[PDB]
Design a protein around this ligand. Structure first.
Ligand code: CU
Length: 80
C-alpha cells in the first residue's frame, strides 16, 4: 500500500563484538526513517555482511535489514 523500509541506515558507537556468536552490540544514534530514539541493539554479522575493521568505542555507519527478531548487517564501517 506504501513504501516499506528495507535497508535501514544508522550511525552509532560499537559497545561489544562477539565473533563466536557473530553479534555486534551497537548503541545507535536516533534513526529518523523509523522514528527510533537512541538504543543499544544487537546486530548480526552474516556471510553477506561487508565488514570493515572496527573495535569497541568506534563511532560507525552501518546499514541493516530486519528479519523477524534479527537485524542483519549489510555493511559497517568507522565513521566521523
Ligand atoms: Cu533501535
Amino acid at each position: 500500500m506504501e513504501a516499506q523500509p528495507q535497508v535501514i541506515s544508522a550511525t552509532g558507537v560499537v559497545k561489544g563484538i562477539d565473533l563466536e556468536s557473530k553479534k555486534i552490540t551497537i548503541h545507535h544514534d536516533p534513526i529518523a526513517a523509523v522514528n527510533a530514539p537512541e538504543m543499544t541493539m544487537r546486530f548480526t554479522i552474516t556471510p553477506q555482511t561487508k565488514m570493515s575493521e572496527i573495535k569497541t568505542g568506534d563511532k560507525v555507519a552501518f546499514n541493516f535489514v530486519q528479519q523477524g527478531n534479527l537485524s542483519l548487517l549489510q555493511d559497517i564501517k568507522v565513521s566521523q
